[PDB]
Structure formats: C-alpha cells, structure tokens
DNA sequence: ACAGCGGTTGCAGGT
DNA sequence: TACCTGCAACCGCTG
C-alpha cells in the first residue's frame, strides 16, 4: 500500500535521454519502498481503422511498444498499454493507483496542447504533482520565439543565429534499475483480466494487414540506436554529407532514414546532434548548414518552432505564414496521384514506394509534392498532406505541413519559377530507371530512352515491351510541358493578390 | 526608403 | 567534372 509514480509515454518512446522518465526512476530509487512505478502508454482502441493511419505505421508502433516494454523489463519494470481515451482513463487510475506524480515530454501540437492542459488541470484538481520536460526537440521552441522578441523566425539563417546563443541541455543515459520494486498490485481492470495492459499484438494494432508491405524499417529504440551507429560508422560520409547530393531514386536509401525513429522519439535528437558534433570535430573537411547532416536536424528544429506559434499550421485558411492560393478541386487527378496512376513513371514509382514501404527520399517527396501542387495538377498541398499522413512512418504534423508549404511556395520558399520536371529530375541520378523498373514493373522492359516518358514510344514498341499504354499502364493525366507554365502564371497572379493585402 | 543580397535540393544547353 | 548562363523574378532581411 504505497503511492504510484506515472510516466506517460506519447512521443519519446525511449529510455535513453528521457528526463521525464529518469525523474520518475531516480525519485523512486532515492525513496525506496515508498512507491510503485507505472510507465504507461494510453491507447485509443476506437481509432485503429480511421483512414489517416496506414497499416505500415501501425506495425511501427506495435514494434516500438514491444521494444519499449522489453527495455523497461531490464530495469525491473514494464510498460502499461492502457486502453481508452485519456480524459476517461486518468481519473480512474489517479484514484485506483493513488498517483503522486505524473510526467511526460511536451508536445507543441494543438490537439495535444489542449489535451495535456485538460489533464494538467485535472492533475491540480486531484493534487497530482506534474513535471513536464522538453526533450523531443533540441531547443525549446517557446524560448526561441521569446528570444526572437515574441515572433518565430520565418527564415533559416535568422533561426540559426537565434538558437546558437542558447544552451543545449545535457544528454542523459538510461534510467536506474529499480531497486526493491514488487509489481504494483492489480487494479480493478487487471483483476478482471491480468493481461489488460500488455503490448497489443500485430492482430490487435493491425486491422488491415493487406496494406502491409516489406518490413524494411523495424520500430523501437534498439533499431534506432543500431541504425544511427550504422550511419555514423563512415565518419567521412557523415562529415561531407550534403542534402542535395543525395539521390532521390537510389534503390537503397541515400540518407540515414532515422526520421521515423526521430518522429516517435525512439531516437533522441539531442543525442544524434551530440554524436554528430564530436564527428565534426574529428573530421577537418566537413559540410556546413543548411546542407549538412546537422543542418537537417536544425531544419526539424526550424519547422517545429514556427509550428508552435500557429495552431492552423496544417491549413492554408487561417495561417499566418501561408500564401493564399486558389487551389482547384480535382477528385480524378487526386485519385490517380494517390495510387501512382498519373502516367508519369517517375512520379508513380515514388508514390508506389510510399504506399508499400512507408518511406520515400526527401527529393522524391519534393518531386511528387511539386507535381500535385504548383507543378502540374494544381491540387492543394492539404490534400497531399493527408496522403502523406496516412502513408509515412515518419508522419510529423510540423514537418509534413512545413515542407508542403515550402514546396508549393506557400511559405518559407518563394522562387516558384523553379519547377521539378517529372521527366528530367530522376534521370540525373538514375539514368537507367532501376527505380522505375522496381516499383512500376509494368514498364520494366522499356529502354532507358523512354522509360521516363512512355508516351514517346510507338504502339508496336509498346507491344514489344509488353506494356500497351491505356491498358497495362495509364495515359499521362496531364501534359507537363504545357500545364506547368500556365501554373507558373497562376502563382504570380496569387502572389500579386497577396501583396495587395500587405 | 527602396535597392541589393542570399536563399537545403529547376531545366536546358553548354563547355 | 562540376561548374557556367540564359529563362523570370519570388520573398525576407539588412542597412
Ligand atoms: C512535402 C514533404 C513532406 C514531408 N513530410 C515529412 C514528415 O511528415 N515527417 C518527416 O520527418 N519528414 C518529412 N519530410 C521532410 C524530409 O523529407 C524527411 O525528414 C527526410 O526525407 C527523412 O529521411 P532521413 O531520415 O533519411 O533524412 P536525413 O537526410 O537523413 O536527415 C536526418 C534527419 O533530419 C531531419 N530532416 C531532414 N530533412 C528535413 C526537412 N526537410 N524538414 C525537417 N526535418 C528534416 C529528419 O528528422 C531526418 O531524420 C517531408 C518532405 C517533403 C518534401
């Protein structure tokens, strides 16, 4: 008959560099036999078949929760995957566990800001001590906005200048092994079913396993650390990394692919930063921001900071940053883009890899995002934002919204006369179309001369390649060489309108 | 005040 | 190779 200390997992699904978790552990061990520890994850079982989460991401979470539990097991504890909505769940477990303290990592997102505040109100209402920590991002956005006179920086170089005069907190290790800790006595839910708070098995989280592609990126802290060290092994590659030089269409990833791990917080962005810094010092010839690997981490920090200031960051309407652009509805052309049936092989190959594997290269993301928006289809960046939210393992509210606005030249980036060619952009790095042959296998017999542009080959040729256009592979839905120039003007028109308000 | 400047990742054509 | 200019000319930041 003791009191309960709760750490609440949401993001930051790791033991390493988790001050919010460490504080629970170091309190408990420094006050032996007076406490029970409940590291919890609150799962809403109602939202398992809501469109905007693909099966691939459900697998990632399932694997992450299973790892987190295995890692907590080693510290003489375990994970508690409590089912229900937080609003219902907390009051019950507050009374039945006799909770003295609650901790969690902060989340700048709106849906969470209001939910956390609602919990934090209830916390005070029940006399439950609450101590939050900022460990998702390297820099706390609210300090960045403050230090820049109550306004989030809208450019990168300004942002770099603001943050490099702020202290970077200590990076922590793994919490203490819990000394003298019996399993917390079974609450009212556990009495009726002992396995009530166990990790959801695949069957439980993944309700639509036919959407599941190859498991190229396993979830969890362990794989996050494994993949990081793997990348940091070639300290030369790390040092001279330049984002634009990385191929969008290489068969194996040209970049680190730590974004899903950074998204869920299986990898501490602080630790990745710290690990990179010491490599920089060891490698005399090394790249500088924005193109550097550390620069990429800073871009994450940049998009986060601006997103904290605007709760309408995911929308055009009501957005302090977003240029107002008269986007047009096209349910047909949206359907084609979403499933990789545009008729542009390069665009299709990327979209198909996204749906199948849940990750695509940044420049590949950039290529398809252009095509949908100002590039060709003139469809809103909010539309592709849904597709990405559904299909990305690294789905990040702030990063997704920020880069879509960057792309469509709604915010941050403005040189709209730079338009990605769905035909040319891919050829540079993949002259043979190995990427297209893999993901759009219909056209795998096509020569490198017209595999990027099948509409250039005759009917006899089409037959000889075993792929007749209109049957085995769609006719291109629009003509890029025509539409992009009309869209360039459409941009300028909207750009003028906007100054006429400012 | 308005103009010069740099700005993660355009394309084509060229050396 | 990894640069070069042309195509039009965008924004925010700085002084
Ligand atoms: C329209 C569009 C939507 C995007 N949506 C997301 C999203 O939902 N979630 C997401 O994590 N990334 C998103 N990206 C940004 C970027 O493409 C990815 O962060 C990157 O491709 C992830 O691969 P990586 O881990 O190998 O990155 P690396 O090149 O290896 O860089 C390492 C880390 O730096 C960070 N980073 C790199 N580029 C960016 C950037 N553009 N903006 C912010 N952080 C960056 C990532 O956290 C990444 O893990 C989007 C890009 C575009 C063009």
Domain boundary among A310, A335, A357: A310
Is strand B in 7 Å reach of the CB of A160? no
Cα→Cα distances A376→A229, A341, A373, A405, Å: 40, 14, 6, 16
A60/A20 Cα distance (integer angstroms): 23
User: Cβ distance A393 to A54 under 8 Å?
Assistant: no
User: Cβ distance A234 to A272 under 8 Å?
Assistant: no
Domain that holds residue A443: 311-496
Through-space separation of residue A489 CA and nucleotide C9 C1' in angstroms: 12
Residue A103 neighbours by CB distance under 10 Å: 22
Residue A144 inside a domain? The answer is yes
Q: Burial letters for A8-33: b for 16+ Cβ neighbours within 10 Å, e otherwise? A: bbbbbbbbbbbbbbbbbbebbbeeee
Residues A281 and A430 grouped into a single domain:
no
Q: Which two tokens stand for residue A212?
A: 């599941």
Residue A264 inside a domain? The answer is yes
Q: A463-470: long-range contacts (C-beta < 8 A, 24 or more apart)?
A: A467/A442, A467/A443, A469/A343
Domain boundary among A310, A335, A361: A310
Residues A357 and A412 grouped into a single domain:
yes
Pocket probe mutation, ligand 1, options A394, A397, A405, A410, max atoms within 8 Å of Cβ: A394
Three-state DSSP at A100 gives strand
Q: What is the CATH number of the domain that holds A40?
A: 3.40.50.620
Residue A212 inside a domain? The answer is no
Determine what percent of chain A falls in helix, strand and coil, rounding each to the nearest 5.
Answer: 50, 5, 45
Residues 6+ apart with CB under 8 A from A181: A28, A36, A37, A76, A77
Cα A499 to ligand 1 centroid, rounded to whole Å: 31
Residue A2 neighbours by CB distance under 10 Å: 15
* Cis? peptide before A160, omega within 30° of 0: no
User: Cβ distance A330 to A377 under 8 Å?
Assistant: yes
- What is residue A455's DSSP assignment? G
CA A230 centroid distance within chain: 21
Q: Which of A421, A487, A419, A423 is nearest to A455 (CA)?
A: A423
Q: Which residues pair with A42 in a beta bridge?
A: A82
Q: Which two tokens stand for residue A270?
A: 């602080």
The closest nt to A323, taking CA to C1', is C11
Which residue shows structure tokens 């800001």?
Answer: A113
User: Cβ distance A232 to A72 under 8 Å?
Assistant: no
Q: What is the CATH number of the domain that holds A161?
A: 1.25.40.80
Is strand C in 7 Å reach of the CB of A156? no
Q: Which two tokens stand for residue A240?
A: 């001279």
Q: Which two tokens stand for residue A294?
A: 């550390």
Task: Indicate left, alpha or beta for A433 from its phi (over 0: left) and psi (-120 to 50: alpha).
Answer: left
Through-space separation of residue A244 CA and nucleotide B7 C1' in angstroms: 14
Q: Which two tokens stand for residue A290?
A: 């924005």
Residues A376 and A484 grouped into a single domain:
yes
Residue A92 inside a domain? The answer is yes
User: Cβ distance A123 to A131 under 8 Å?
Assistant: no
Atom 19 of ligand 1, residue of closest alpha carbon: A259
Q: Is A299 annotated as a binding residue?
A: yes
Task: Indicate left, alpha or beta for A12 from its phi (over 0: left) and psi (-120 to 50: alpha).
Answer: left
Is strand C in 7 Å reach of the CB of A431? no
The closest nt to A412, taking CA to C1', is C11
- What is residue A361's DSSP assignment? -
Residue A194 neighbours by CB distance under 10 Å: 10
> How many domains would you assign to chain A?
3
Q: Which of A196, A175, A222, A272 is nearest to A63 (CA)?
A: A222
Residue A369 inside a domain? The answer is yes
Residues A12 and A80 grouped into a single domain:
yes
At A184, give phi and psi (nearest 5°): -55, 140
Nearest atom within ligand 1 for CA of residue A253: 26
Q: What is the dihedral of CA A24, A28, A34, A38, to 10 degrees?
A: 40
Through-space separation of residue A29 CA and nucleotide C2 C1' in angstroms: 60
Residues A274 and A336 grouped into a single domain:
no
Give the binding-site residues of ligand 1, using a 6 Å CB cut-off. Answer: A 243, 255-259, 262-263, 296-297, 299-300, 303, 361-362, 365-366, 369, 388, 392, 394-396, 399-400, 403-404, 407
Residues A278 and A321 grouped into a single domain:
no
Cα A400 to ligand 1 centroid, rounded to whole Å: 8
Strand order across the A3-9 sheet: A80-83, A35-43, A3-9, A99-105, A129-133
Nearest atom within ligand 1 for CA of residue A389: 8
Residues A391 and A245 grouped into a single domain:
no
- Solved using: X-ray
Through-space separation of residue A342 CA and nucleotide C1 C1' in angstroms: 35
User: Cβ distance A35 to A5 under 8 Å?
Assistant: yes
Residue nearest to nucleotide C8 (CA to C1'): A417
Residue A265 inside a domain? The answer is yes
Is strand C in 7 Å reach of the CB of A492? yes
Q: How many helices (H) and strands (E) does chain A have?
A: 22, 5
Domain boundary among A265, A288, A310: A310
Residue A408 inside a domain? The answer is yes
Strand B nucleotides within 7 Å of a protein CB: 7-12
Atom 29 of ligand 1, residue of closest alpha carbon: A255
Q: Is A396 annotated as a binding residue?
A: yes
Through-space separation of residue A292 CA and nucleotide C15 C1' in angstroms: 30
Residues A341 and A467 grouped into a single domain:
yes
Q: How many CA atoms lie within 13 A of A81 on its CB side?
A: 20
Residues A123 and A140 grouped into a single domain:
no
User: Cβ distance A208 to A55 under 8 Å?
Assistant: yes
Cα A297 to ligand 1 centroid, rounded to whole Å: 9
Residue A197 inside a domain? The answer is no
User: Cβ distance A373 to A488 under 8 Å?
Assistant: no
User: Cβ distance A102 to A8 under 8 Å?
Assistant: yes
User: Cβ distance A12 to A18 under 8 Å?
Assistant: yes
Residues 188-227 of chain A within 7 A of strand C, judged by CB, are none
A424/A417 Cα distance (integer angstroms): 16
Reported structure resolution in angstroms: 3.2
Through-space separation of residue A297 CA and nucleotide C4 C1' in angstroms: 32
Q: What is the CATH number of the domain that holds A395?
A: 1.10.579.10
CA A194 centroid distance within chain: 34
Residues A238 and A253 grouped into a single domain:
yes
Is strand B in 7 Å reach of the CB of A488? no
Residues A162 and A303 grouped into a single domain:
yes
Three-state DSSP at A58 gives helix
Nearest atom within ligand 1 for CA of residue A302: 43
Residues A379 and A448 grouped into a single domain:
yes
Atom 21 of ligand 1, residue of closest alpha carbon: A362
């Amino acid at each position: 008959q003791r009191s309960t200390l709760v750490h609440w997992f949401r993001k930051g699904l790791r033991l390493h560099d988790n001050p919010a978790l460490s504080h629970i552990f170091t309190a408990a061990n420094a006050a032996p036999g007076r406490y029970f520890v409940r590291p919890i994850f609150i799962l809403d079982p109602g939202i398992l078949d809501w469109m905007q989460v693909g099966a691939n991401r459900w697998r990632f979470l399932q694997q992450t929760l299973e790892d987190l539990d295995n890692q907590l097991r080693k510290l003489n504890s375990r994970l508690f995957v409590v089912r229900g909505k937080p609003a219902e769940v907390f009051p019950r477990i507050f009374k039945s566990w006799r909770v003295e303290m609650l901790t969690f990592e902060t989340d700048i997102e709106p849906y969470s800001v209001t939910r956390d505040a609602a919990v934090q109100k209830l916390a005070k209402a029940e006399g439950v001590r609450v101590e939050t920590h900022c460990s998702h991002t390297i820099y706390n956005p609210e300090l960045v906005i403050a230090k820049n006179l109550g306004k989030a920086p809208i450019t990168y170089q300004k942002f770099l200048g603001i943050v490099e005069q702020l202290k970077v907190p200590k990076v922590l290790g793994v919490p203490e092994k819990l000394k003298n800790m019996p399993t917390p006595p079974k609450d009212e839910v556990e009495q009726k079913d002992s396995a009530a708070y166990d990790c959801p098995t695949m069957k439980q989280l993944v309700k639509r396993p036919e959407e599941l592609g190859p498991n190229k990126f396993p979830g969890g802290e362990t794989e996050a650390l494994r993949r990081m060290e793997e990348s940091l092994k070639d300290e030369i590659w790390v040092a001279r990394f330049e984002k634009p030089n990385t191929a969008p269409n290489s068969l194996e990833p040209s970049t680190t692919v730590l974004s899903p791990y950074l998204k869920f917080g299986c990898l501490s962005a602080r630790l990745f930063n710290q690990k990179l810094k010491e490599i920089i010092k060891r490698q005399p010839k090394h790249s500088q921001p924005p193109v550097s690997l550390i620069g990429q981490l800073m871009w994450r920090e940049f998009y986060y900071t601006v997103a904290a200031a605007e709760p309408n960051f995911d929308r055009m309407l009501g957005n302090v940053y977003c240029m107002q652009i008269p986007w047009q509805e096209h349910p047909d052309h949206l359907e084609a883009w979403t499933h990789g049936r545009t008729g542009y092989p390069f665009i299709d190959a990327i979209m198909r890899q996204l749906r199948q594997e849940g990750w695509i290269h940044h420049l590949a993301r950039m290529a398809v995002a252009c095509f949908l928006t100002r590039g060709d289809l003139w469809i809103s960046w909010e539309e592709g934002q849904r597709v990405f939210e559904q299909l990305l393992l690294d789905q990040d509210w702030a990063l997704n919204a920020g880069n879509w606005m960057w792309l469509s030249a709604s915010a941050f980036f403005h040189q709209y006369f730079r338009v990605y060619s769905p035909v040319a952009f891919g050829k540079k790095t993949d002259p043979q179309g190995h990427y297209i042959r893999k993901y759009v296998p219909e056209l795998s017999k096509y020569p490198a001369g017209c595999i990027y542009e099948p509409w250039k080959a005759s009917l006899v040729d089409q037959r000889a390649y075993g792929c007749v256009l209109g049957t085995d592979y769609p006719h291109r839905i629009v003509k890029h060489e025509v539409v992009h120039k009309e869209n360039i003007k459409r941009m300028g028109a909207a750009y003028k309108v906007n100054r006429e308000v400012r």
